[PDB]
Amino acid sequence: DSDIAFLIDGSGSIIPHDFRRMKEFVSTVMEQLKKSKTLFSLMQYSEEFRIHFTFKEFQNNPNPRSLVKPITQLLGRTHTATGIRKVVRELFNITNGARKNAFKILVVITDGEKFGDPLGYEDVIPEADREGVIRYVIGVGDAFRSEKSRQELNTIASKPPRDHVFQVNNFEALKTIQNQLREK
Ligand SMILES: [Ca+2]
Secondary structure (H helix, E strand, C coil): CEEEEEEEECCCCCCHHHHHHHHHHHHHHHHHCCCCCEEEEEEEECCCEEEEECHHHHHHCCCHHHHHCCCCCCCCCECHHHHHHHHHHHHCCHHHCCCCCCEEEEEEEECCCCEECCCCHHHCHHHHHHCCEEEEEEECCCCCCCHHHHHHHHHHCCCCHHHCEEECCCCCHHHHHHHHHHHC
16 A cells, blocks of 8 residues: 655765665665555666666565665766656656555655756655655755755655654654554
8 A cells, every 4th residue: 555665865975874874774664664565666866867676676576685785876966856756757657566546655865965956846846745745854964964955855855844854863763754654
């Protein structure tokens, strides 16, 4: 009943230590929220986009650590808004494994510093809302130490953002989220 996608920031601003955290967070979530009726998908982004595993591919090999271990950082710019648009349109595409009727959950992991992207959030959020894609934002790096980046997470996250935005090293975020998913 749940299709869960991850949009992970692979741009250059993302320090290697932090990209690893992103992969460790994603792997743990998959292992924790592993429900017989829950599929996972992941796309990495910078200026270019990469679907590491579709819902179908996960359904064919539900081994989190196996799917996440080969993932290498793309580097480059940060086209977050475009990435969100591609996720809803490409990941939650039934030709990719997405199931009609299932709840749509997107976990966006970034440092909150969109750059180079020709699209603004205001261009991709309405469509996400329209597709009923619930958004969780996990902030890595200095995402919370800047006024700009802090608001970027709030802008991406569903309402209320305070209930949808977590720090990557708040190891208690997965249980809060999981607790929340019982209230879809
Ligand atoms: Ca970046």
